[PDB]
Design an enzyme around this catalytic site. Structure first.
Site, PDB file in Angstrom:
ATOM      1  N   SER C 316     -46.435  34.410   7.125  1.00 43.80           N
ATOM      2  CA  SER C 316     -47.495  35.212   7.717  1.00 43.80           C
ATOM      3  C   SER C 316     -48.842  34.583   7.384  1.00 43.80           C
ATOM      4  CB  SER C 316     -47.427  36.647   7.188  1.00 43.80           C
ATOM      5  OG  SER C 316     -48.654  37.323   7.365  1.00 43.80           O
ATOM      6  N   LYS C 322     -47.144  31.614   0.011  1.00 43.71           N
ATOM      7  CA  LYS C 322     -45.823  32.128  -0.353  1.00 43.71           C
ATOM      8  C   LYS C 322     -44.789  31.204   0.274  1.00 43.71           C
ATOM      9  CE  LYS C 322     -43.130  36.356  -1.310  1.00 43.71           C
ATOM     10  NZ  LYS C 322     -41.615  36.128  -1.257  1.00 43.71           N
TER      11      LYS C 322
END
Lengths: 456, 456, 459, 459
Positions: C316, C322
């Site tokens: 995202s 991440k």
């Protein structure tokens, strides 16, 4: 004894029993890990003592430890190896995952006892010191893996492999003794074409020969020792010759081919050598399970089973329970479970150290005891006394339908198949069916149907 | 003692140590099964003594055993239960697969000792007889499975379940104590959206609550007792009330809800109740492994790990090894291996009897000791003392990228994503990146980015 | 749309557009268990076994040249992927593998008949039992195919991938040989080592595993073929067993030999129990390596973060950085699978009776699955993770130098007691070792920089 | 022949005739490990989870009616078997199951777009993340699908087959209640019991197993959906978790509930570790039953031979009466498989970290395989073996009466000593008990027939 002695470590003072030789860190472990009943086995205690004895010798050679202290430590270790101090090692398997606390147990017992051997006393006024002297040049992180491999390799070489060879020889003798006894084959548990009892037993023999080779292939990796890698594998704070010297000294005093591990990071971060060696042991367990089951099924009876062989009756109509077979099949299950525990421990290292080590070596050394002693017991209390029941073997063979193909070259496949089908449908022997159809005489049947010609 | 006493069975005479209370069949087992070091655990010895005590009471009630003999047998059994005769049970796990030899061990010790209690002597001139009196109405085939279930149910009820409840309560207290401490989440080991330390611990609590229910569901089947099925399950040579009476008497003297097994064939031919109950125990092991790993990873440091919590330092810079976590993770591996051994034994019954029983109960009772004592140890030496490192928790949370979504309602998703990308690329905090772009003031950041609003 | 085929139980309808026969059709109605079928490796090994048996039977004058050649041609079609849909049978069949043996006999007979200008079905010119199964039993054919598939899969898939991954990690170890990082024992800060040294542990593990796997190969190369029903070789030519092992060695280029004891070869799966022991060893090593990689890459801010790994999946835009260690997850999962497979294999291998082990489809299903998992998993982990491992040099040095572990470098300069005093004040007050040293006036800034050398603390 | 789809890493070519998107296509290039894919049960459970999430999102005003209806219609197509080839991903993927979650999001979005008169691809009218994944995370979707598949498979396949097999064996037990046979303990001749009693042990085992399996169902019925990324439910409607569990309960007719602790639900596979414990218990029971059946049927002449079983496979005309117990072999093999699967599951279940267990594809692959094996194996064993078990009454009586075990019936008539003397002479000289009794003049033929009654020795 109720009376205590105050022992100290960097955390403070703690009371230990006055009649014991351990120190503060042993006492803390004893009190903090009251988990079940499993303790370090004697083989591992001995391997720790051997490790300290070797380290003391090399530290003296390198000028790092006085002769007087090194000699007293080695004397204390020899007392442990002679069985004089078994009650001085009270710690659980279920302790710190590095085995640090059992390392310290040996350091404290040897230091307190070496102090006595130099005319000193046990306790805080001791002349020999657990960390500075007995643990000199060492870490728990390389000592405990070293003791694991010393115990494991010696148990495989001195207990398991000799008992495997003995059982193999016995079964080879039986295979030769029974080489001419033809019996019914069984595949899928169903009557099948014949083989000799000696041929069947030769399969057990070949299994045990193959297992010995697999076990032998696992020994070189177990012979690699972590000692000298110290805390994380770099050997920081060791003499450059120390790792080779202490592996050489262990090889001298054990008469086994120990070598320093070529990669100390693999040696500290894993139990891989023991995961692999135990793979060979669970192979042996699967083989022994099969052999034990063949023996008890072939001996089953005395009248409503197979009954082709008899076994020695060792514990009190006609009911002889195959108790050696039962002990052996039970310990083979144990080895399979132990392999899973070892695999989980071996898969679970993190970074510079595997800290599942007491559990891994508890399982590994148990499997070696079970297989070694189980083979020793099965051999002397069962295998050496296996005998054929020749009349029963012949009854089963001759009343089966599986000798019918001996008729093919004489009367043809179609008539032989007709005879077998009639025998099966009407509950007759092959001979009675063949005679009833008029296809041969009894003399011809006896001349033609020769089991000894049907086994290669 | 060197001096011997001659003891007899149907096979003949054999020498036993003069200072021991066992008889001929114990001596034969001791000599014929010298396999490793594992012996019947005390819990199982006690359960065998309880079984004999109950059988003696019921046999007396039914007029089958004299009051004088029944009372002396029960007195001898009470001495065993009081810990006076531990050295009278020398037999290995790796014996006959029915446990016959340990059944006979109890019969012989109780008979010889009961004879003494009636003014008689141990040995061939005894007044009380191992088979005719102590084993009256019984077979090894229903006694040993009964002792297995008595030992198993009592260990689960009296050791494991209480320690599970205690650890659960401690962690529930911690969850409440830390209910308002927001910390970074971790999924896939990667920084993730926040939750409170109390929420995270509530997961451990819910795990232990669920495990208690699963363990409780397994207890009714273990409470079914084989006693009264005698040799093959038919109860041949028993009074019709004997099976119910002896289960009732065991329920009386143990305060546990034992009942006679409704199908004695299932009870003799299988270890199914223990296979199922151990399924619940390996579930608990997988849960405890996860909890122990969370604790040691969250406590890792003191400077190069996570360091969000501190744990008690129990054994001797800043290096606190999580030794309780290591003992617990090690025994959780052991339970997984033990489950495989049990499953193999349980899968291996034949016809009227499962004869893998000493191995099955050795593993089962070990798993119960490990889990009960391991939870007891982990609770008192680790769990009760878990504390947050509040400054470190906040440092990690505030320097992470995971609070950025708090900006969305104020400045929009596109600017919030731009801030997070700039922070990640340039090695900045979210606040420093947002200020550098001019998208908000420091007061606005502090007002808007509220972790306590992001945990539900 | 269907044809009628026959065996000794009578007639049964078989799909006209399939090449199997009555016995395969019967197995499809009696063994409808789950979804696992024979893997392609095993089907190919069965076809190779029939191809070799036909060649030797022709050599010995037992099978006509035209039939032997047609059987070999049909087997070659199977090996070439032309008949994957002709082998529909479950793993969960007769424990000797009879049904899959007959599946191959029927497919090859019906197809060889077509190659001779005949048809499939009961008018066929080539016969499943009398021709394709000549000199054979299901009892010795299926263990032969098991070992052919196993040995070739280890030689051609697993060992090459293991070597490839080892070479990658060896290159990384050399490239990072001078990067000092903090050690970790018990998950706790420990004395330093280089990233290259740490990775060299992984390399040594993979090298040791290769040796263990190699040690298992000679026993797997022993073939049961020639033992026939119970191991005696009744009704076979005395040269058949050696000749067919030789022929398999020729056509596979692998060192197959006839099993010296056919009773061990028929009554057990011992070679595969032992070989799978080495595979579960590799699974435990790979689990550890994969866990080191994902823990070392954990973060990007609240874990360890000493290395970076390739980012292969989309994320995202509001969560940059991440990076889930998804190759490590696939690899650790399949390592669990190999451990479970080992237990299934051990139970099957422990369960032979008398002349035959009849747990064989299950044993080979597990064994070949573990080989696929380990070979493909090592390929995937190598290509999509290991080749891209890089250090985060600033983070490595931050952890190393903000730690307390370098304090022992001060011992031989200011004594044990002063150095300990420095470490305890740094810990107690949240200081660096240098800060707690300067604050206590135990050294100057230049003495610290000179004395505390991590590159001198890694042996 | 290909279309270009996009995710946050950029554009990638996808087969034009497939319905998945960029993320599924990426997974196909990064997780090429072995051959195991998600099973149909799990694909269906994923579609049900998306169908329920769409319904609840529409109820809460978060998703438009036309989109929610089209998503539900596309999910119904998956459940109806129209899209099996649209789910190509390996088990051996991201440990959270993200890739299969996205596989379903993309297939349903592209197909729902077509149902709304749009097209598949980047011009689609329905969006995989914003629409099909609304209110969801891979983290809570995949464990929800795991439990939906597991509970429905236990309720609809395993438990019905277990009941069916139990009923068959109960009928056999009653039918053979009066057939006295020889007991066997330690494999040795033992005192008698009836064949019905022996079979009643099998029945009681299956009844106990059913109870144990039933006890595991409440925990599996707890669903993670609503916990989203870490268990807090951040960014979700406060009623969403209950509403979506209720909707799943409605459309599946099973008692699904929202998990009372979402942190336990996300961080563990504990419910499945426990439920699989009951399945390995059933595997150990079935192993024993299957072994009794094949040993009791062994022969036809050199084993036990007390029962006959159906002959389902052809044999050779020259070996009539060889009946291999092939259903018993398939069943014992799959019971070994269940034991191995349990170990793989236990390792995965023990290996969660912090907020998420990421061993999930492997755990559910094993769990659903064990359910298929046990359900289908019980169906096969029942239909093709158990329903046809028959006694061999003459052989049973031959073994019983030619044995030595009935001697204790003589105790209360001629004393223990005389009866023992009879048994030992019969054993020593190969006599029947009656023969050794008449020879010793300890009774007449009529006294033996009157005193030694096996039907009076079975309780």
């Amino acid at each position: 004894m109720n009376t205590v002695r105050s022992e100290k470590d960097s955390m403070g003072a703690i009371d230990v029993p006055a009649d014991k030789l351990w120190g503060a860190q042993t006492q803390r472990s004893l009190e903090h890990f009251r988990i079940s009943t499993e303790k370090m086995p004697t083989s591992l205690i001995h391997a720790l003592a051997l490790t300290k004895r070797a380290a003391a010798k090399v530290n003296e050679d390198l000028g790092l430890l006085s002769e007087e202290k090194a000699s007293a430590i080695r004397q204390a270790a020899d007392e442990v190896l002679a069985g004089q101090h078994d009650d001085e090692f009270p710690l659980a398997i279920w302790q710190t995952g590095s085995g640090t606390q059992s390392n310290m147990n040996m350091n404290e017992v040897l230091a307190n006892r070496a102090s006595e051997l130099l005319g000193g006393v046990r306790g805080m006024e001791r002349k020999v010191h657990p960390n500075d002297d007995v643990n000199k040049s060492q870490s728990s992180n390389d000592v405990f893996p070293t003791a694991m491999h010393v115990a494991a390799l010696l148990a495989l070489r001195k207990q398991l492999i000799p008992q495997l060879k003995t059982l193999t020889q016995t079964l080879n003798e039986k295979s030769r003794a029974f080489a001419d006894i033809v019996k019914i084959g069984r595949t899928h548990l169903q009557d099948a074409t014949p083989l000799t009892l000696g041929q069947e037993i030769s399969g057990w023999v070949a299994m045990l020969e193959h297992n010995l080779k697999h076990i032998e292939y696992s020994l070189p990796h177990v012979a690699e020792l972590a000692l000298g890698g110290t805390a994380v594998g770099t050997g920081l704070n060791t003499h450059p010759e120390y790792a080779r010297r202490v592996a050489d000294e262990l090889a001298v005093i054990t008469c086994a081919p120990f070598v320093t591990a070529p990669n100390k990071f693999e040696a500290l971060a894993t139990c891989d050598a023991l995961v692999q060696a135990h793979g060979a042991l669970k192979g042996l367990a699967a083989s022994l399970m099969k052999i034990a089951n063949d023996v008890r099924w072939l001996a089953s009876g005395p009248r409503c089973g197979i009954g082709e062989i008899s076994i020695p009756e060792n514990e009190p109509p006609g009911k002889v329970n195959p108790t050696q077979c039962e002990a052996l099949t039970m310990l083979c299950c144990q080895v399979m479970g132990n392999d899973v525990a070892i695999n989980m421990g071996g898969a679970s290292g993190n970074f510079e150290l595997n800290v599942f080590r007491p559990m891994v070596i508890h399982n590994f050394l148990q499997s070696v005891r079970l297989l070694a002693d189980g083979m020793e017991s099965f051999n002397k209390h069962c295998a050496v006394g296996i005998e054929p029941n020749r009349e029963r073997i012949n009854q089963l063979l001759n009343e089966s339908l599986m000798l019918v193909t001996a008729l093919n070259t004489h009367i043809g496949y179609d008539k032989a198949a007709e005879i077998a089908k009639k025998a099966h449908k009407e509950g007759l022997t092959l001979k009675a069916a063949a005679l009833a159809l008029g296809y041969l005489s009894e003399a011809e049947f006896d001349s033609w149907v020769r089991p000894e010609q049907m086994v290669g």
